[PDB]
Amino acid sequence: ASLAIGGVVIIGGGGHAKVVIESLRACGETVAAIVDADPAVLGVPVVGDDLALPMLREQGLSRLFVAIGDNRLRQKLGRKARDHGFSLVNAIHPSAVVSPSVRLGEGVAVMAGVAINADSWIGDLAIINTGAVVDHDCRLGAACHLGPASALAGGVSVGERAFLGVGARVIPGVTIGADTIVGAGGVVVRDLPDSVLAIGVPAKIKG
Amino acid sequence: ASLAIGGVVIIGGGGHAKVVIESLRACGETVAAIVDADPAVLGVPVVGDDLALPMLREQGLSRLFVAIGDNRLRQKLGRKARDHGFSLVNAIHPSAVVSPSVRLGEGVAVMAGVAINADSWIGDLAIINTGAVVDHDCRLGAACHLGPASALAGGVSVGERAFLGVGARVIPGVTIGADTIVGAGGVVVRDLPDSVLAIGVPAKIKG
Amino acid sequence: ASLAIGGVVIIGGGGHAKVVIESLRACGETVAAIVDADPAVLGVPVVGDDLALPMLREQGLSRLFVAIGDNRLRQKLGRKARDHGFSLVNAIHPSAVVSPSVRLGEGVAVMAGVAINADSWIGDLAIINTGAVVDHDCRLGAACHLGPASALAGGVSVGERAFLGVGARVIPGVTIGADTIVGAGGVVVRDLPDSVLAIGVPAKIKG
Ligand SMILES: CC(C)(COP(=O)(O)OP(=O)(O)OC[C@H]1O[C@@H](n2cnc3c(N)ncnc32)[C@H](O)[C@@H]1OP(=O)(O)O)[C@@H](O)C(=O)NCCC(=O)NCCS
Ligand SMILES: CC(C)(COP(=O)(O)OP(=O)(O)OC[C@H]1O[C@@H](n2cnc3c(N)ncnc32)[C@H](O)[C@@H]1OP(=O)(O)O)[C@@H](O)C(=O)NCCC(=O)NCCS
Ligand SMILES: CC(C)(COP(=O)(O)OP(=O)(O)OC[C@H]1O[C@@H](n2cnc3c(N)ncnc32)[C@H](O)[C@@H]1OP(=O)(O)O)[C@@H](O)C(=O)NCCC(=O)NCCS
Ligand SMILES: CC(=O)N[C@H]1[C@H](O)[C@H](O)[C@@H](OP(=O)(O)OP(=O)(O)OC[C@H]2O[C@@H](n3cnc4c(=O)[nH]c(N)nc43)[C@H](O)[C@@H]2O)O[C@@H]1C
Ligand SMILES: CC(=O)N[C@H]1[C@H](O)[C@H](O)[C@@H](OP(=O)(O)OP(=O)(O)OC[C@H]2O[C@@H](n3cnc4c(=O)[nH]c(N)nc43)[C@H](O)[C@@H]2O)O[C@@H]1C
Ligand SMILES: CC(=O)N[C@H]1[C@H](O)[C@H](O)[C@@H](OP(=O)(O)OP(=O)(O)OC[C@H]2O[C@@H](n3cnc4c(=O)[nH]c(N)nc43)[C@H](O)[C@@H]2O)O[C@@H]1C
Ligand SMILES: [Cl-]
Ligand SMILES: [Cl-]
Ligand SMILES: [Cl-]
Ligand SMILES: [Cl-]
Ligand SMILES: [Cl-]
Ligand SMILES: [Cl-]
């Protein structure tokens, strides 16, 4: 628990955390410490579990990222971090292309190779994973996850906590409900309700 | 209709125009005005419909981009713009990787995150949309459209006005006819004639 | 056979070589000569077939790249080049994003637009082709080939000489055997043994 002055605290110490750490460092940020439910990751010390958050705040650390893949859990831990007095930073790799008219929330991960086009809105705690494409006028709800190499054409809306697997695609104007999962490679050609799983080319709901 | 000296005139004021405007600005270009069939877009004034083109030319504007998604219409409006004395510029996002041996036409859109490899030829008025990949020795006909996150392997030929939906893929050496549509996610494994629709993995013509 | 002092020798003079040459030049390297079984490519002289390798070495050239698409042949020619006293360079386009914790072998091609994330290991003579994504903690065996716009999620292992076609996708934690082929667009959702062909969404072994 001895730490430097000023860096970012990470909740989570798994594979997703490794990628987030590297995005932060590529921007010139310092990663101070990890809290993990199993109480180092790429040279960052694991200092305890989430009970260590008050201690970290008291010692002057005030900036945090939630590096947890599970969308519902990430959302819950973001709220906890904010309650403890932390501000949620963004982890945006410098190679990502984020249009100047994009609206970004807080606690957002944007991985290497991403492109996000004009007038898209990205909710708090979203993940836009490696190589993903978000075209113009999209709306991404809080804590959703666009997996690696996924792509949204224009005017797509993605509900809170929805998850699109590696290489999923969505055609223009479609709306996907909250808590829905699109399997890897699924090609979504019609609106999806909340709380379903859809797979295939074209994607079809699986009961 | 009062405008600055020197910028680019845009035909079209929709979603595609927004993305094109941002590519142009990312390169340091100034966008002077829009003409739209409904007579501002990201701060660019809409000054009239296409009947305003002579007026614009007379006031010294001579550079133009056709930001219209529909391929046949785009092609027609490009010809009209040239007849009115405009030169068609290219709108190439600075993040796109365009090989030094690529041959580019005029009025071409190349969005963020694109890669185009050696000895590919890109016809006038083509769109190479966000994140798309064009491998070596490809031939893209005038006014075709490679949609977001689409990919052509080596030696692929795409006919005039053809359209490949989001995430379409084409294997090496295939030829796709003029006016053909490949649905989102379609994986083209054999030559396609002119004026067909093909969908699926592998892509199959739908009557 | 008169050449400059210091550049890279290329085995192979086909389409793949063109792309490799351009990656090398984008990095500031000089390409000295090609050896090809048919005894210029983008301005690089073809000086003979592989029997010219001793001659090249004797004249002071010591750096080489094997620009051959076929994985088994590439692997064989890499061994031959090393036996003749050449060091195998890497051909990594400057636009590729290679994480600082990635382990790279020798003779590796990494094309434009690629992203490779944390703690991935890339075997000698691998090809990571245009726009491909390799997420965290992946293991790519010697002489494998990830085709254009392909994507591996986290923790994927790819065997020696395996080949993933354009736009193939692999979900987290999957292992693909040596010498296996995944067709274009295939979405791999379960481990694959050695020496099979798998196609489709989801990918299925074809006898
Ligand atoms: C669709 C998915 C959620 C199913 O998970 P699951 O229900 O645990 O599925 P299983 O692995 O048991 O497979 C159940 C069945 O679905 C099929 N299937 C699995 N994934 C599929 C996919 N993406 N597309 C089409 N079919 C799929 C299987 O072939 C199997 O078929 P069967 O009943 O003929 O045996 C999952 O396979 C998937 O695609 N996850 C996305 C993961 C991802 O991309 N992560 C990236 C993290 S950044
Ligand atoms: C293929 C396509 C052209 C069909 O358009 P459409 O004929 O208006 O089709 P509909 O939405 O009425 O769907 C007709 C049928 O095709 C199926 N389908 C639609 N798109 C499909 C696709 N891409 N792949 C496979 N099947 C598809 C539907 O499930 C429906 O099946 P059904 O008869 O069982 O109900 C269109 O869905 C598409 O893929 N457009 C590409 C758009 C795009 O990517 N734009 C990017 C702009 S930059
Ligand atoms: C799968 C593959 C290896 C098959 O090659 P092949 O056996 O010579 O196949 P053919 O072209 O004769 O097609 C055999 C059959 O497979 C089907 N098919 C071919 N490729 C397919 C694919 N990728 N996915 C699904 N089906 C496919 C065909 O429609 C045909 O079906 P049929 O028996 O109904 O006529 C090949 O088509 C492929 O995908 N190659 C990947 C190439 C690539 O991406 N290169 C990039 C280089 S960097
Ligand atoms: C590209 C890709 O496939 N990325 C995947 C990755 O492959 C994994 O499937 C997954 O990454 P994640 O890093 O979340 O999972 P894992 O590697 O299993 O690590 C989860 C970490 O979270 C920790 N953890 C879980 N619950 C909590 C919790 O409540 N609090 C804290 N502080 N840590 C927690 C857990 O102990 C573990 O170290 O999700 C990502 C989206
Ligand atoms: C990534 C993506 O999905 N992009 C799509 C996008 O989502 C749309 O589906 C579509 O974009 P486009 O901008 O062409 O469409 P829309 O947003 O509908 O705007 C078309 C504009 O063109 C105008 N227009 C149509 N006909 C003409 C015409 O004849 N002349 C002029 N000057 N303008 C015209 C029309 O008034 C409108 O403002 O095409 C793109 C390829
Ligand atoms: C993006 C894409 O589709 N790339 C493909 C590309 O489209 C081709 O299908 C293929 O490229 P490659 O350049 O290997 O193939 P090709 O264009 O046919 O050229 C092979 C070259 O290797 C030469 N060659 C073959 N065997 C040998 C050999 O034994 N030694 C030497 N020195 N050269 C050899 C042959 O003479 C020819 O010039 O593989 C790539 C992965
Ligand atoms: Cl650090
Ligand atoms: Cl359905
Ligand atoms: Cl402007
Ligand atoms: Cl067919
Ligand atoms: Cl050179
Ligand atoms: Cl199978």
PDB file of C-alpha atoms in Angstrom, chain B:
ATOM      1  CA  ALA B   1     -25.468  33.104 -49.507  1.00  0.00           C
ATOM      2  CA  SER B   2     -22.621  35.118 -48.122  1.00  0.00           C
ATOM      3  CA  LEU B   3     -19.651  32.800 -47.965  1.00  0.00           C
ATOM      4  CA  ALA B   4     -15.930  32.797 -47.394  1.00  0.00           C
ATOM      5  CA  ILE B   5     -13.308  32.612 -50.165  1.00  0.00           C
ATOM      6  CA  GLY B   6     -12.046  29.098 -51.148  1.00  0.00           C
ATOM      7  CA  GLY B   7     -13.704  26.129 -49.664  1.00  0.00           C
ATOM      8  CA  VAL B   8     -15.432  22.955 -50.737  1.00  0.00           C
ATOM      9  CA  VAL B   9     -19.086  22.830 -51.791  1.00  0.00           C
ATOM     10  CA  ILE B  10     -21.013  19.681 -50.666  1.00  0.00           C
ATOM     11  CA  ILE B  11     -23.928  18.154 -52.606  1.00  0.00           C
ATOM     12  CA  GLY B  12     -26.058  16.437 -49.948  1.00  0.00           C
ATOM     13  CA  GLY B  13     -26.774  17.268 -46.297  1.00  0.00           C
ATOM     14  CA  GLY B  14     -27.574  13.928 -44.675  1.00  0.00           C
ATOM     15  CA  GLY B  15     -25.732  11.485 -42.416  1.00  0.00           C
ATOM     16  CA  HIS B  16     -23.149  10.604 -45.061  1.00  0.00           C
ATOM     17  CA  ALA B  17     -22.426  14.322 -45.493  1.00  0.00           C
ATOM     18  CA  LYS B  18     -21.704  14.663 -41.778  1.00  0.00           C
ATOM     19  CA  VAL B  19     -18.973  12.001 -42.010  1.00  0.00           C
ATOM     20  CA  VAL B  20     -17.524  13.528 -45.205  1.00  0.00           C
ATOM     21  CA  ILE B  21     -17.450  17.009 -43.638  1.00  0.00           C
ATOM     22  CA  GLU B  22     -15.453  15.623 -40.708  1.00  0.00           C
ATOM     23  CA  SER B  23     -12.957  13.877 -43.037  1.00  0.00           C
ATOM     24  CA  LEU B  24     -12.431  17.128 -44.943  1.00  0.00           C
ATOM     25  CA  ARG B  25     -11.977  19.170 -41.777  1.00  0.00           C
ATOM     26  CA  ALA B  26      -9.549  16.571 -40.334  1.00  0.00           C
ATOM     27  CA  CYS B  27      -7.383  17.270 -43.412  1.00  0.00           C
ATOM     28  CA  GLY B  28      -7.462  21.036 -42.856  1.00  0.00           C
ATOM     29  CA  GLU B  29      -9.988  21.786 -45.568  1.00  0.00           C
ATOM     30  CA  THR B  30     -12.775  24.365 -45.214  1.00  0.00           C
ATOM     31  CA  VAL B  31     -16.343  23.372 -46.174  1.00  0.00           C
ATOM     32  CA  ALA B  32     -18.039  26.398 -47.741  1.00  0.00           C
ATOM     33  CA  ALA B  33     -21.700  25.402 -48.199  1.00  0.00           C
ATOM     34  CA  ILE B  34     -24.200  22.589 -48.795  1.00  0.00           C
ATOM     35  CA  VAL B  35     -26.783  22.240 -51.555  1.00  0.00           C
ATOM     36  CA  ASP B  36     -29.651  19.935 -50.564  1.00  0.00           C
ATOM     37  CA  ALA B  37     -32.932  18.934 -52.203  1.00  0.00           C
ATOM     38  CA  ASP B  38     -34.618  20.077 -49.070  1.00  0.00           C
ATOM     39  CA  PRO B  39     -33.320  23.721 -49.517  1.00  0.00           C
ATOM     40  CA  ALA B  40     -27.011  23.736 -41.346  1.00  0.00           C
ATOM     41  CA  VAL B  41     -25.131  20.471 -41.158  1.00  0.00           C
ATOM     42  CA  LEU B  42     -22.356  20.386 -38.498  1.00  0.00           C
ATOM     43  CA  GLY B  43     -22.092  24.155 -38.822  1.00  0.00           C
ATOM     44  CA  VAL B  44     -22.062  24.255 -42.666  1.00  0.00           C
ATOM     45  CA  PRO B  45     -24.869  26.384 -44.140  1.00  0.00           C
ATOM     46  CA  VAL B  46     -27.399  24.887 -46.522  1.00  0.00           C
ATOM     47  CA  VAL B  47     -27.684  27.587 -49.176  1.00  0.00           C
ATOM     48  CA  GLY B  48     -30.292  26.106 -51.572  1.00  0.00           C
ATOM     49  CA  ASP B  49     -30.875  23.109 -53.806  1.00  0.00           C
ATOM     50  CA  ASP B  50     -28.909  22.125 -56.896  1.00  0.00           C
ATOM     51  CA  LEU B  51     -30.217  25.222 -58.741  1.00  0.00           C
ATOM     52  CA  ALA B  52     -27.796  27.200 -56.519  1.00  0.00           C
ATOM     53  CA  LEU B  53     -24.738  25.526 -58.174  1.00  0.00           C
ATOM     54  CA  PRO B  54     -24.294  28.205 -60.944  1.00  0.00           C
ATOM     55  CA  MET B  55     -24.468  30.942 -58.303  1.00  0.00           C
ATOM     56  CA  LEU B  56     -21.794  29.230 -56.196  1.00  0.00           C
ATOM     57  CA  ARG B  57     -19.499  28.819 -59.224  1.00  0.00           C
ATOM     58  CA  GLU B  58     -19.917  32.464 -60.246  1.00  0.00           C
ATOM     59  CA  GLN B  59     -18.836  33.581 -56.760  1.00  0.00           C
ATOM     60  CA  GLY B  60     -15.564  31.757 -57.160  1.00  0.00           C
ATOM     61  CA  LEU B  61     -16.163  28.390 -55.560  1.00  0.00           C
ATOM     62  CA  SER B  62     -14.791  25.648 -57.770  1.00  0.00           C
ATOM     63  CA  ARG B  63     -14.163  22.597 -55.580  1.00  0.00           C
ATOM     64  CA  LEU B  64     -16.965  20.134 -54.767  1.00  0.00           C
ATOM     65  CA  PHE B  65     -17.765  16.771 -53.122  1.00  0.00           C
ATOM     66  CA  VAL B  66     -20.917  14.671 -53.748  1.00  0.00           C
ATOM     67  CA  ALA B  67     -22.012  13.340 -50.316  1.00  0.00           C
ATOM     68  CA  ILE B  68     -24.921  11.194 -51.478  1.00  0.00           C
ATOM     69  CA  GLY B  69     -25.079   7.531 -50.456  1.00  0.00           C
ATOM     70  CA  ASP B  70     -27.200   6.274 -53.367  1.00  0.00           C
ATOM     71  CA  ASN B  71     -24.691   5.193 -56.002  1.00  0.00           C
ATOM     72  CA  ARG B  72     -26.642   5.934 -59.198  1.00  0.00           C
ATOM     73  CA  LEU B  73     -27.725   9.361 -57.938  1.00  0.00           C
ATOM     74  CA  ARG B  74     -24.215  10.207 -56.726  1.00  0.00           C
ATOM     75  CA  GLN B  75     -22.846   9.369 -60.148  1.00  0.00           C
ATOM     76  CA  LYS B  76     -25.445  11.608 -61.851  1.00  0.00           C
ATOM     77  CA  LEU B  77     -24.769  14.527 -59.509  1.00  0.00           C
ATOM     78  CA  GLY B  78     -21.026  14.215 -60.051  1.00  0.00           C
ATOM     79  CA  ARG B  79     -21.534  14.638 -63.787  1.00  0.00           C
ATOM     80  CA  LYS B  80     -23.801  17.662 -63.154  1.00  0.00           C
ATOM     81  CA  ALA B  81     -21.218  19.263 -60.857  1.00  0.00           C
ATOM     82  CA  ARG B  82     -18.482  18.827 -63.464  1.00  0.00           C
ATOM     83  CA  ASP B  83     -20.709  20.274 -66.180  1.00  0.00           C
ATOM     84  CA  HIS B  84     -21.172  23.362 -63.905  1.00  0.00           C
ATOM     85  CA  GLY B  85     -17.369  23.841 -63.726  1.00  0.00           C
ATOM     86  CA  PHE B  86     -16.584  22.235 -60.408  1.00  0.00           C
ATOM     87  CA  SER B  87     -13.589  19.945 -59.772  1.00  0.00           C
ATOM     88  CA  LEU B  88     -14.398  16.888 -57.652  1.00  0.00           C
ATOM     89  CA  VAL B  89     -12.125  16.659 -54.604  1.00  0.00           C
ATOM     90  CA  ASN B  90     -11.423  13.543 -52.556  1.00  0.00           C
ATOM     91  CA  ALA B  91     -12.514  13.224 -48.886  1.00  0.00           C
ATOM     92  CA  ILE B  92      -9.882  10.961 -47.317  1.00  0.00           C
ATOM     93  CA  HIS B  93      -9.703  10.768 -43.538  1.00  0.00           C
ATOM     94  CA  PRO B  94      -6.083  11.188 -42.308  1.00  0.00           C
ATOM     95  CA  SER B  95      -6.245   7.846 -40.394  1.00  0.00           C
ATOM     96  CA  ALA B  96      -6.870   5.925 -43.625  1.00  0.00           C
ATOM     97  CA  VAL B  97      -3.818   4.071 -44.966  1.00  0.00           C
ATOM     98  CA  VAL B  98      -3.651   4.450 -48.743  1.00  0.00           C
ATOM     99  CA  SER B  99      -0.630   2.678 -50.304  1.00  0.00           C
ATOM    100  CA  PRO B 100       1.647   4.800 -52.510  1.00  0.00           C
ATOM    101  CA  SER B 101       0.910   2.606 -55.537  1.00  0.00           C
ATOM    102  CA  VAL B 102      -2.884   3.028 -55.265  1.00  0.00           C
ATOM    103  CA  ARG B 103      -4.542   4.863 -58.190  1.00  0.00           C
ATOM    104  CA  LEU B 104      -7.330   7.178 -56.966  1.00  0.00           C
ATOM    105  CA  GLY B 105     -10.048   8.776 -59.040  1.00  0.00           C
ATOM    106  CA  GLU B 106     -11.918  11.982 -58.133  1.00  0.00           C
ATOM    107  CA  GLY B 107     -14.869  12.476 -55.814  1.00  0.00           C
ATOM    108  CA  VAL B 108     -13.770   9.466 -53.758  1.00  0.00           C
ATOM    109  CA  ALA B 109     -14.694   9.087 -50.045  1.00  0.00           C
ATOM    110  CA  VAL B 110     -12.248   7.115 -47.875  1.00  0.00           C
ATOM    111  CA  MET B 111     -13.394   6.994 -44.237  1.00  0.00           C
ATOM    112  CA  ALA B 112     -11.494   6.626 -40.961  1.00  0.00           C
ATOM    113  CA  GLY B 113      -9.707   3.378 -40.309  1.00  0.00           C
ATOM    114  CA  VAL B 114      -9.574   2.171 -43.937  1.00  0.00           C
ATOM    115  CA  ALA B 115      -6.596   0.333 -45.439  1.00  0.00           C
ATOM    116  CA  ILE B 116      -6.020   0.100 -49.215  1.00  0.00           C
ATOM    117  CA  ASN B 117      -3.006  -1.985 -50.390  1.00  0.00           C
ATOM    118  CA  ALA B 118      -0.622  -2.057 -53.334  1.00  0.00           C
ATOM    119  CA  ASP B 119      -1.656  -1.512 -56.948  1.00  0.00           C
ATOM    120  CA  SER B 120      -5.382  -1.162 -56.244  1.00  0.00           C
ATOM    121  CA  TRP B 121      -7.389   1.165 -58.507  1.00  0.00           C
ATOM    122  CA  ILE B 122     -10.266   3.195 -57.110  1.00  0.00           C
ATOM    123  CA  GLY B 123     -12.777   4.645 -59.596  1.00  0.00           C
ATOM    124  CA  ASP B 124     -14.295   8.110 -59.496  1.00  0.00           C
ATOM    125  CA  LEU B 125     -17.069   8.615 -56.928  1.00  0.00           C
ATOM    126  CA  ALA B 126     -16.375   5.372 -55.036  1.00  0.00           C
ATOM    127  CA  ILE B 127     -17.050   5.149 -51.287  1.00  0.00           C
ATOM    128  CA  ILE B 128     -14.640   3.105 -49.132  1.00  0.00           C
ATOM    129  CA  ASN B 129     -16.507   3.343 -45.842  1.00  0.00           C
ATOM    130  CA  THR B 130     -15.417   3.238 -42.224  1.00  0.00           C
ATOM    131  CA  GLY B 131     -12.899   0.540 -41.373  1.00  0.00           C
ATOM    132  CA  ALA B 132     -13.091  -1.193 -44.764  1.00  0.00           C
ATOM    133  CA  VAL B 133     -10.114  -3.155 -46.144  1.00  0.00           C
ATOM    134  CA  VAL B 134      -9.086  -3.327 -49.809  1.00  0.00           C
ATOM    135  CA  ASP B 135      -6.153  -5.708 -50.347  1.00  0.00           C
ATOM    136  CA  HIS B 136      -3.626  -5.662 -53.207  1.00  0.00           C
ATOM    137  CA  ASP B 137      -4.479  -5.552 -56.905  1.00  0.00           C
ATOM    138  CA  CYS B 138      -8.200  -4.751 -56.512  1.00  0.00           C
ATOM    139  CA  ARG B 139     -10.262  -2.821 -59.088  1.00  0.00           C
ATOM    140  CA  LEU B 140     -13.158  -0.715 -57.805  1.00  0.00           C
ATOM    141  CA  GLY B 141     -15.480   0.666 -60.489  1.00  0.00           C
ATOM    142  CA  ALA B 142     -16.891   4.161 -60.586  1.00  0.00           C
ATOM    143  CA  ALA B 143     -19.525   4.951 -57.970  1.00  0.00           C
ATOM    144  CA  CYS B 144     -19.301   1.636 -56.126  1.00  0.00           C
ATOM    145  CA  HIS B 145     -19.657   1.513 -52.316  1.00  0.00           C
ATOM    146  CA  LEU B 146     -17.728  -0.750 -49.906  1.00  0.00           C
ATOM    147  CA  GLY B 147     -19.716  -0.462 -46.692  1.00  0.00           C
ATOM    148  CA  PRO B 148     -18.294  -0.137 -43.156  1.00  0.00           C
ATOM    149  CA  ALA B 149     -16.040  -2.972 -42.021  1.00  0.00           C
ATOM    150  CA  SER B 150     -16.253  -4.737 -45.426  1.00  0.00           C
ATOM    151  CA  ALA B 151     -13.146  -6.516 -46.756  1.00  0.00           C
ATOM    152  CA  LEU B 152     -11.799  -7.509 -50.194  1.00  0.00           C
ATOM    153  CA  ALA B 153      -8.921  -9.972 -50.392  1.00  0.00           C
ATOM    154  CA  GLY B 154      -6.453  -9.681 -53.259  1.00  0.00           C
ATOM    155  CA  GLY B 155      -7.339  -9.291 -56.915  1.00  0.00           C
ATOM    156  CA  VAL B 156     -11.048  -8.535 -56.449  1.00  0.00           C
ATOM    157  CA  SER B 157     -12.984  -6.501 -59.060  1.00  0.00           C
ATOM    158  CA  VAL B 158     -16.121  -4.588 -58.096  1.00  0.00           C
ATOM    159  CA  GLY B 159     -18.374  -3.239 -60.854  1.00  0.00           C
ATOM    160  CA  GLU B 160     -19.732   0.274 -61.294  1.00  0.00           C
ATOM    161  CA  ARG B 161     -22.393   1.204 -58.695  1.00  0.00           C
ATOM    162  CA  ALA B 162     -22.101  -2.116 -56.857  1.00  0.00           C
ATOM    163  CA  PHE B 163     -22.792  -2.031 -53.090  1.00  0.00           C
ATOM    164  CA  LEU B 164     -21.330  -4.217 -50.372  1.00  0.00           C
ATOM    165  CA  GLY B 165     -23.181  -4.004 -47.031  1.00  0.00           C
ATOM    166  CA  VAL B 166     -21.631  -3.674 -43.578  1.00  0.00           C
ATOM    167  CA  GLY B 167     -19.142  -6.459 -42.955  1.00  0.00           C
ATOM    168  CA  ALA B 168     -19.349  -8.093 -46.404  1.00  0.00           C
ATOM    169  CA  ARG B 169     -16.282 -10.130 -47.451  1.00  0.00           C
ATOM    170  CA  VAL B 170     -14.926 -11.217 -50.825  1.00  0.00           C
ATOM    171  CA  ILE B 171     -12.280 -13.962 -51.352  1.00  0.00           C
ATOM    172  CA  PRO B 172      -9.336 -13.536 -53.737  1.00  0.00           C
ATOM    173  CA  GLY B 173      -9.803 -13.126 -57.473  1.00  0.00           C
ATOM    174  CA  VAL B 174     -13.610 -12.736 -57.480  1.00  0.00           C
ATOM    175  CA  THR B 175     -15.410 -10.385 -59.857  1.00  0.00           C
ATOM    176  CA  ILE B 176     -18.706  -8.698 -58.865  1.00  0.00           C
ATOM    177  CA  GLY B 177     -20.833  -7.188 -61.591  1.00  0.00           C
ATOM    178  CA  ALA B 178     -22.102  -3.660 -61.962  1.00  0.00           C
ATOM    179  CA  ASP B 179     -25.246  -2.685 -59.968  1.00  0.00           C
ATOM    180  CA  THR B 180     -25.002  -5.755 -57.697  1.00  0.00           C
ATOM    181  CA  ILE B 181     -25.795  -5.679 -53.977  1.00  0.00           C
ATOM    182  CA  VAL B 182     -24.113  -7.935 -51.391  1.00  0.00           C
ATOM    183  CA  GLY B 183     -26.094  -7.929 -48.150  1.00  0.00           C
ATOM    184  CA  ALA B 184     -24.548  -7.144 -44.774  1.00  0.00           C
ATOM    185  CA  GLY B 185     -22.253  -9.960 -43.709  1.00  0.00           C
ATOM    186  CA  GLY B 186     -22.351 -11.713 -47.091  1.00  0.00           C
ATOM    187  CA  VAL B 187     -19.260 -13.822 -47.877  1.00  0.00           C
ATOM    188  CA  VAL B 188     -18.720 -13.924 -51.672  1.00  0.00           C
ATOM    189  CA  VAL B 189     -16.945 -17.067 -52.839  1.00  0.00           C
ATOM    190  CA  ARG B 190     -17.784 -17.051 -56.603  1.00  0.00           C
ATOM    191  CA  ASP B 191     -18.178 -14.394 -59.296  1.00  0.00           C
ATOM    192  CA  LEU B 192     -21.438 -12.461 -59.307  1.00  0.00           C
ATOM    193  CA  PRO B 193     -23.130 -11.176 -62.488  1.00  0.00           C
ATOM    194  CA  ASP B 194     -24.538  -7.668 -62.925  1.00  0.00           C
ATOM    195  CA  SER B 195     -27.782  -6.540 -61.252  1.00  0.00           C
ATOM    196  CA  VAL B 196     -28.236  -9.227 -58.612  1.00  0.00           C
ATOM    197  CA  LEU B 197     -28.679  -9.397 -54.818  1.00  0.00           C
ATOM    198  CA  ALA B 198     -26.568 -11.945 -52.914  1.00  0.00           C
ATOM    199  CA  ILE B 199     -26.879 -12.755 -49.183  1.00  0.00           C
ATOM    200  CA  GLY B 200     -25.476 -15.257 -46.709  1.00  0.00           C
ATOM    201  CA  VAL B 201     -22.391 -17.214 -45.691  1.00  0.00           C
ATOM    202  CA  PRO B 202     -21.609 -18.212 -48.390  1.00  0.00           C
ATOM    203  CA  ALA B 203     -23.459 -15.563 -50.402  1.00  0.00           C
ATOM    204  CA  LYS B 204     -26.239 -16.842 -52.652  1.00  0.00           C
ATOM    205  CA  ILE B 205     -28.264 -14.931 -55.253  1.00  0.00           C
ATOM    206  CA  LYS B 206     -31.824 -14.159 -54.125  1.00  0.00           C
ATOM    207  CA  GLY B 207     -34.354 -13.975 -57.015  1.00  0.00           C
TER     208      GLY B 207
END
